[PDB]
Design a protein around this ligand. Sequence first.
Ligand SMILES: O=c1ccn([C@@H]2O[C@H](COP(=O)(O)OP(=O)(O)OP(=O)(O)O)[C@@H](O)[C@H]2O)c(=O)[nH]1
Ligand SMILES: [Mg+2]
Ligand SMILES: [Mg+2]
Lengths: 239, 142, 157, 315, 133
Amino acid sequence: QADRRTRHHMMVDGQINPREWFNWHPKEYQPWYFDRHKFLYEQRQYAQFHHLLCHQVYLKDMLHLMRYPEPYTHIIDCRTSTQKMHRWVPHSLWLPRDEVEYALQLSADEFLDMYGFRKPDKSDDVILLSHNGIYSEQAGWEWKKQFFQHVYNYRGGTNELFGESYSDMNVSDVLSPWKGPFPQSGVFVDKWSKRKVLTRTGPFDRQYEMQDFALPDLELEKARHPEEGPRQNMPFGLQ
Amino acid sequence: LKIAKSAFGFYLARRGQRKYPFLRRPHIKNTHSMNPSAPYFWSFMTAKSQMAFLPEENYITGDWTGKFFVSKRQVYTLQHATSGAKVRVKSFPSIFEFNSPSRWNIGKEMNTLTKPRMDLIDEQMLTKKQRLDYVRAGLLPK
Amino acid sequence: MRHIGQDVPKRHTHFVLESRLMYEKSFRDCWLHSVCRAISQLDEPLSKTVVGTHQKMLQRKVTCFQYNQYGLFKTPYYRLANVDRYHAVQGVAGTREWVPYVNVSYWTMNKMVRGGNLLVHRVHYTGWGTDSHLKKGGWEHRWNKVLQRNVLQYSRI
Amino acid sequence: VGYTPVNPDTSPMVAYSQYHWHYNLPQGMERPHSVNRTFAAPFQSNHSLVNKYRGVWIEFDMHPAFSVALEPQLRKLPRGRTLPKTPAEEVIADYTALAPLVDDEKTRDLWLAKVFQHCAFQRCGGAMELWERYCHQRFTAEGATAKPPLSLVKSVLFYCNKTDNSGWRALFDRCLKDGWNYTPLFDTAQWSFMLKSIGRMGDEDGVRAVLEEMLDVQADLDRVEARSVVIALNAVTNADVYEFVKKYLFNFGERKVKFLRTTYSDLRGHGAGKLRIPLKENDNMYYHVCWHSSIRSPRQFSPRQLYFDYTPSTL
Amino acid sequence: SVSGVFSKGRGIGHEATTSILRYIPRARVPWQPSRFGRENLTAADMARLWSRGRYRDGPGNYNSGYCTERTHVLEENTVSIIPRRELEKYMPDITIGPKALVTPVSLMNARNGHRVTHDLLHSYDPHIGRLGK
RNA sequence: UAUUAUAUUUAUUCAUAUAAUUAAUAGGAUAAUAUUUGUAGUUUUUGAUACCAUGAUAAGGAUUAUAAAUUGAAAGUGUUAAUAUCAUAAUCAAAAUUUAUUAUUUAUAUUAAAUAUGUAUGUGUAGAUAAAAUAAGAAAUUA
Ligand SMILES: O=c1ccn([C@@H]2O[C@H](COP(=O)(O)OP(=O)(O)OP(=O)(O)O)[C@@H](O)[C@H]2O)c(=O)[nH]1
Ligand SMILES: [Mg+2]
Ligand SMILES: [Mg+2]
């Protein structure tokens, strides 16, 4: 008939019941879109870095610049480990990501002495390069914070160029299932009624929704559920 | 209201004996509708012109299964008497039937043939208090 | 329904909506109804062209048509119930328990005026008012002046 | 105070409060507002446009000499927005008989294009013979140099779609950049009809080629008629083309994609009658178009649905 | 333990679409996830519901003339219906038929937009009178 | 004690309520083209109800007086905001008097448009009651 999942309860098992429409900060109803199929750093979890992103440069631009170089466009290789880099992107130069913060604070001379090539002026085009396009992005943020006017990241960079599959960092799309209780750092007291209410941090987070969302192929999606259908634990009207 | 004789007993207030504008009292209760007049017989509580057609309610307007009672503004017609068919009207307690047909009814509305307030009173629809008050007015014997 | 998950505190507020539809039905049926009345009751000839047996015939034809119209709204306005859009309190119009320009009952007018919600102006409770016209002939006179500026100032064509 | 809230415009106890403007202050406008000027929205109605031609316009350019000379023959063929009911056999007989007498290439071909269009509206199948008899020799065969007049091509294509015909693929191919380069001059309705036909016939590969060209030529994607996109997509069963169609689906707009789903669910649904030929079952493509729609729409929060089974853990 | 208003109901939309569509989660209204609307009523129940709600004129009301009950009870008194064949003996039948209920297009503006003199208002738009379709 | 008057006038036959389903959005001529013509995913909840379910505005003269000035008051009279856990009761006409709380036409001429009151002539006649010092006209027995 009814039970803790179906009934109205302010609290279930000593913690705020996430099932109540009125236990959430109304801001959580505001409309949003799915990120996950977009480039890693455009996603919403990285929002603190969003002001910093870099204008892109596509594969076409890259081949064009291979055959037809510009004098004051610099292509800068950000690949960090020498163990993983076996080829040379034409007309590129090597500033590994790990050094960037230091490198960009050298004088023209000192920079010349440490990296063996001229430090790009702040007007010049700077194209950044990495395996996946992740380290190149982070490096980009560095170059942008010293204020460099044209900084382009080429995502998919060395992997697309050379057909290698390598990665700058090992990060995986899957989030580890949330462990503890709901964090008191996300609990949001209301200012008018002084009423405690959930936010979408923690075990409730949009990442988890997108992660477990229906697959985009009917066959793989039907494989995921029992014969009779997708949600049979629920009463018909909650399905 | 004090006693609820219908649903509205719950919703309505009496407001003591309150005055309404002329000929608008919220509830149309025609106590006078049967109020004998020989000389005014054809003009009183009937159509203002004798060239008016009979109302809607003397006619079968649509495809009907049948009715329980006909309306009380229906006018009694020679066929009401002659045809020997059920002629009912909604009065209180339940329904009044015209059983004993007469031509003297003809041409008047059944409003006028049905006494709204009967000289007859049920002692069993009355509280002991109400029965007392009906004995004071010299209606019920006691 | 059956008092399950009702949204409004008073159920009867819905009746107010029903009422609106009544007026709508009247707009749909007034012209028709009145034409059928006028053509039905006309004793003089209708016209030069329609007279005599044709006219009698046409009259009966029309009132037959009018009786056939199921659901045609013939109820006179003063017999429709006035009920508040707020608390669903009812009052008889033309009485001190109904307030006409806001169309709310006395009860709601009181509540709304005292906690400021309506903007009105208080005037001495015992007189005719600030208004010139009411000051002259009272309710009937002001009623008349309204007729005069709605209609009579026009010489129609 | 109550279950019914105050409405802030009519209540003087809101309007004249300290958080708003009192009636004794000077009542002028506070700040100006330019909304429509700063960032303006383009007009898109919820309803489709009522006057639009809704067909494939065949562009009749005739010299006003043969236009008068040929009038008793042309009066039987479609003029603008007018579709005479003359039986197609008769019209083709008239062309076969009288056309060799006319000397103009341009005239003979405008006339032919009218014949084709007329036969497209009646769905008479024996009209391709006309293509093989006159046009094929100087247009489609053995690398002939000559470049057909646009209206003729549009007409023949329109005929191959209206009468579902394998022939279209040969003509269409000649219209890409290296050939006649006619493809960027096609109407949105042209694309619509093409897609629908190809879909019925069931060529995933035709569908792919056509969607690629449409996209490159900058057709109006959102205004391609939804029914025809659905019937085309429905035709796709092959793994690679399927991949293509996901990636491609991202080219439509939010709204378009929502109604791709609605239309799809209707054509296999309630509105299965609406089609002359019933759809064929693609459960995969149906599911996918629904899924795509769901991905691209704004997301709503229904917490009792998401967290239905949530239990807290003390780990 | 369970008190319903209606015993059974039905789906607005049909097998081909639904069987596949179910693998995609749809967001229900957060505060009242289950929706049972008048499209979902059974045929019988819709008929009953549709009769009621029309004051006196409407077929639900026992005395409208459209009543299918053979008997009705006023204050413990049982009244048997007068059949129409019998009603007609004293109360003549003037019945035009359905054409009487529809005025021409010409009059639509006199009538504030309507052609139809029926008891419910009739809209010409798709949505107000929409059932499932 | 000075800053000033109740003992006048007119009234009192007082009645009116009924025929159950409150739950969502959707734009069209003179717009650069969407059939989005015809927008189709039943089913897990329970209070304002006929019913217990707090709030809030009435009426009700008794001593701040005359000048350039109001004879109507907060102590609360059905409908309004946190206690729920029997029930569809609501006017769209034409309808059934028991309810303290209501100024009706009284003798020349008397029912025409929504249908509109048939009853009580009795020596202005018991007991008991009502109203007024304000554009009217009243004058002498405070705590
Ligand atoms: O978007 C729409 C809406 C409606 N229709 C209508 O559907 C009817 C039958 O639907 P079909 O779409 O099966 O017919 P069809 O291909 O032969 O029609 P054309 O589009 O080629 O003319 C067609 O005859 C047309 O009137 C559409 O074709 N497209
Ligand atoms: Mg109180
Ligand atoms: Mg009701």
